[PDB]
Paper text:
X-ray crystal structures of [name] alone and in complex with hexanoyl-CoA reveal the molecular basis for medium chain acyl-CoA recognition by this unusual YCC β-subunit, prompting us to rename it medium chain acyl-CoA carboxylase beta subunit (MccB). Similar to other bacterial YCC β-subunits, MccB has 3–2 symmetry and is composed of three individual dimers that form a ring-like hexamer. Each monomer can be divided into two domains harbouring two copies of the crotonase fold that pack together in an antiparallel manner to form a dimer. Taken together, these results establish the existence of a unique YCC-dependent pathway for unusual polyketide extender unit biosynthesis.
To develop a better understanding of the molecular basis for the unique substrate specificity of the acyl-CoA carboxylase β-subunit encoded by [name], hereafter referred to as MccB, we solved its crystal structure to 2.45 Å. The active site of MccB is located at the dimerization interface for two opposing monomers where residues 137–237 from the N-terminus of monomer B are packed against residues 392–492 from the C-terminus of the next proximal monomer F. The individual monomers themselves superimpose well with a backbone Cα RMSD of 0.167 Å. Overall, MccB has a high degree of structural similarity to the previously solved β-subunit of propionyl-CoA carboxylase PccB from Streptomyces coelicolor21, with a Cα backbone RMSD of 0.738 Å. Consequently, the vast majority of the known substrate and cofactor binding residues of YCC β-subunits are both structurally and sequentially conserved for MccB, PccB and AccD5 from Mycobacterium tuberculosis 2122. The greatest structural deviations of MccB from previously solved structures occur near residues 33–46 and 452–477. Residues 33–46 of MccB form a long α-helix resulting in a larger cavity near the substrate binding zone. Residues 452–477 of MccB could not be modelled in the apo structure, highlighting this region's high degree of flexibility. In contrast, the region corresponding to residues 452–477 for PccB adopts a partially ordered helix–loop–helix motif. The high flexibility of MccB in the vicinity of the substrate binding pocket is consistent with its ability to bind larger acyl-CoA substrates than PccB.
Residue numbers in the entry:
A (entry chain A): 12 to 75, 81 to 454, 475 to 532
B (entry chain D): 106 to 449, 479 to 532
C (entry chain F): 15 to 74, 81 to 216, 219 to 452, 480 to 532
Amino acid sequence: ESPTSTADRIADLAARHEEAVVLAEKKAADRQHLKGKLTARARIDLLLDPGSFVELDEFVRHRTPRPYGDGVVTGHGTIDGRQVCVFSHDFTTLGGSMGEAFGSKVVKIYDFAMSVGCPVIGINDSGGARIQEGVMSIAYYTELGVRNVHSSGVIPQISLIMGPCAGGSVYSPALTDFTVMVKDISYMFVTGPEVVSAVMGEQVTAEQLGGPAVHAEVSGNAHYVGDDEQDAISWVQTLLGYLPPNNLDPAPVYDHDCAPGITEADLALDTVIPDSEQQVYDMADVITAVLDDGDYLEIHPDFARNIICALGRVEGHSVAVVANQPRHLAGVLDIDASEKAARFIRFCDSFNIPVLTFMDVPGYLPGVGQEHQGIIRRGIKLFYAYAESTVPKITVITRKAYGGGYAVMGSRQIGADRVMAWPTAEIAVMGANSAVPILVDDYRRRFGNPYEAAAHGYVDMVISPSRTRYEVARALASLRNKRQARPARKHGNIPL
Amino acid sequence: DFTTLGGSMGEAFGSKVVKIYDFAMSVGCPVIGINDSGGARIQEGVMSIAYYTELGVRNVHSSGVIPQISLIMGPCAGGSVYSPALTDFTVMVKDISYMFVTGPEVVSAVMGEQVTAEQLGGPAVHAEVSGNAHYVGDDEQDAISWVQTLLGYLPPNNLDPAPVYDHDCAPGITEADLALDTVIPDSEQQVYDMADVITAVLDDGDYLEIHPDFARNIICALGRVEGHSVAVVANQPRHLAGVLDIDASEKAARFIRFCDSFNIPVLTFMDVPGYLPGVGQEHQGIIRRGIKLFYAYAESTVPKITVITRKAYGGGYAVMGSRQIGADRVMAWPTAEIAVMGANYRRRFGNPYEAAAHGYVDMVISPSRTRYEVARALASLRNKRQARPARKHGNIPL
Amino acid sequence: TSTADRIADLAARHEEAVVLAEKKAADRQHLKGKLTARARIDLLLDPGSFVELDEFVRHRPRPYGDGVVTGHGTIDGRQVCVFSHDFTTLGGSMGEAFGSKVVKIYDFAMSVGCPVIGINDSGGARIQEGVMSIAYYTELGVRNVHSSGVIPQISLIMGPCAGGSVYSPALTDFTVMVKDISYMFVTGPEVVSAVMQVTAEQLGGPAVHAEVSGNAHYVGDDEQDAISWVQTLLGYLPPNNLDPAPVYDHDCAPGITEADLALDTVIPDSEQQVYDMADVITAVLDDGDYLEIHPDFARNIICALGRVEGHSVAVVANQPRHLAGVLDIDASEKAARFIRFCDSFNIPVLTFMDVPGYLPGVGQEHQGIIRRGIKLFYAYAESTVPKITVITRKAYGGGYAVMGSRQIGADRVMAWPTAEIAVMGANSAVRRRFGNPYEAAAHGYVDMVISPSRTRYEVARALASLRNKRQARPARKHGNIPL
């Protein structure tokens, strides 16, 4: 019911707003704080620019307790001045459970984001499906999932996991481009610990089964884990600072403080590669020499540490970095590193971010484990990602460049636009220990260098390492107007 | 030709394969590669790698453009695996073929593992464990025959139509159809063979099965209805109660995306209780890998018909070609149980009628009618046109 | 339970949903001289071709189907989608379940590109559902707008159709009502009389919309005739705006016939004597037959679909038997929308012209003959389908400009020796020297001057010569036609 008078309806609206927000927030704060968690609205407030939030569907209700908003807070705002859409589950209101009203609110802000081409950040903290709504619940899960698939590579999609996330709740995060978890308040699994322990013979805790560390290091479902909710939200904002709003519009360009000439940071790369091939180096020291301010945002820091995927800038422009890391498993490629880099590269290609590869790859990790778990069809994903991509590709060969690993890591035949090799680059069909299908020191002298590849034009230049920053910046600037045609098809058939 | 220079990859060799692949892309016809190689020609150094890469690149730019089929009829190691891995179907032959990125010499010298080539990457390994092999022939005649039969279902390319064959379906109800009224057991812990339903519906009771020895809890096959190519994805309760898991999800997911690329409609037979639980499945990444099948269904635009024979719980029901994921026609049997969960109640909710009340299902039929209604739906959907997101490509989880 | 028991349980609800519901519905509808929703679906579609969807959908008394029968089928072998309100169940009123069923049939028809036939017989909005009903009305309306010119849309009005119920029929391409059993109005006679005293038939009965308002393109004597009318109409149309129209075999005489020669005498000698333009049209079309649109509305103009050599042809022709064939508001809007529809579905336009000018008067000017008569000019100029024009007699000023003259875009314009193509008539220019087509012919504004007996023969040839016509269109979301 409503009042009749105009002033009384304005007052009545103020009362319902008071109940739906101010009251609902006080009380949610009490229940969440005793579990070390923030409220849906506190997270929205930390994520968005102050004063930018426009809340939608504040007075939506389900159709049979009927709290305003139905357990999710939705709307849009800005992050560092650029528009974004937002939803944030309220775990304290009907469990943040997936219902038709809840789901319709999330569907609307997703439709809006697709309509204007802006990113979507989902803040997840849910008790799961709303069982009393029966199959209706499933329908809306599927609706949201379908939008994720139709937004994939169109608008950036980021998932923050800041509470329970089980069952159908895992479906939308799984389809977004980045999933960010938080240290002690989040977990993630399709099937829960109690039923795993009831049908399978396994007694496991929620954190052992699908805690943050599991997905950051073992399954690879988590691209970053924040120490606290603030650290995760900050990571998300920093990531958005590298991305375009959509796959058509340009990425942001920032002012820079790049040295035009040789610096001591540049001269340090002349000694970064050890004399002995037993000794490794930290690729990060190479990467930081090239990127603006020596800084980058690392994707999957704790997953497949034998390869680095990161976003940085050169002369104020977004650049994606993929680099073999000799500090872990000698920088060989394997299943985890290949899927890690493969999806990173395909994402950057969709949103027109050029890829800067630093190569030092001795080969693949050999064992029964790798073959039986499918290194062929899963390692080939990185080949597919490189060959499919049309963004500018610049490749710096620092050391090992053996066989298929060399082929995959942004070689010129796979589509790289500029390939430079240091004199430490060893570009060969295989190492000298493997080439005894026909003394290994002699082979090492003839072929442990880039000059056969350079002689065939497979690399474009062989430079002193200190020139790297400079040449990368040149190559990048020369490639910004690149246009490359794509095969005509509904889509490819990438191995899965 | 393995007997000539080891059948090894070089610039001349490689340029010959480059020329035939360029031709096939040029006229839009399928490519069948027959592999039997000692590997890279090391005397040619990086040249060999370059050409491997060239062929790989062509495979990627042909993916979803022309059907690509790889027969592995011998050794296939190192660089040799790259092109087969990128084609759409890999067919091996027992006793004579194997595939691995790194060979046993290096596995033992680097990892301390003593394994033979056949244990490391033999046909059984790739047909049953890794999934790299979509079919393994007993002999070469059987593998070649399999490849030709497969081609008989497929269009030459992603624009031209698939072949249509002469037909012999009985116009009215048969006893094979009426047999489906009895296939679902009364007792719910008792299973049935989903293959009997599939063979009841398809022409000649026949289908060419993809990945027969891999993830047998799901069936992927090509068959025909009234002479037209139809792709079948079906839960098989004979293995793991028809549960979904990592292997089944990736198997069906790629099958569906390939069929979508070449305009083959997808007919789903649903009977899924849920997902396989365990530390194994979660830590091996069931979230991001199981979701691949959801991506495949939701992305696809070919006609999709779904027959719900029995269990239809939660996310399993969502993924298996529900209407909300994009299916154009969804019919349910009276044995269909469409609910959020099973018993985590059974009398009021163990049936298709709440989903039917919401229009989430289009149809509740006696099973003997399935073949007929499926045929009608398929024929009614051949002119389907559906728009696709504008993008270079999506960002499917890998 | 048991598997056999669930099959039997399903048989019980199926009989409950259709057979028992059908006999009660048939009773309550026969009590008003109307057939059932399912009976009409069965008269419309090919026997046994109907596939019903959403048979057990229920709202949130809960009857199966929620008061509308939805599905798809074939008409004379070609696929069509159909919905049919059941007035006896919950008033055949618009609710969310009801609405979702028609939305699904509409989505399907848009998806496969086949026509939609809606059969309307509704108590209006389901008030108990509040705004939900409006929401769903709107959904359906939007789909009509996005189907407009994409798939043929036909509305059968076979009972009450008031309030929100009028919105979707108004947006379809053809609305057909039935004598004595149907009516249409935005607001009902109750409130209309409460600000004025009127009955439903005088406010919005079929005769009103067939002759006065123009909302009804045809009125059937009974339901069977209206349905037959719709099937005959679909036999002329493509399934959608991309795929070709049906082509039938014919037995056209290859040479000049006596039927052809009868037109040499059809135009009277003295210019105050009028003729029946229909005799010319029937001389040109296959079997002397055509399907007339808006037969009782603006009868100074004829709009019809016929065939030449088995191919669909649209005919727009001035009719001197009514208002001497002048153009007016009603005739302009009728012909204009017919032409735009035919252009959307790639049906060529055959014009027969005998136009002395416009109907004069305060009535016509004050009600906007400028902005509404100009719609027909827009329709001709916008259209890109082949346009063939036969000028039988009067060809005066803007009237001649509008009916498919060559400068407005016609591809072939032939004139009889009785054609008087002039800037204005004899009385207004202050004529024996100008009462003829030859200054127009001398300028090439007409392409040929023929003896009337040649008409059919040249028309057919022109038609056959133009099937591969392509014409570029302005780059725009859409135009700004006057409304």
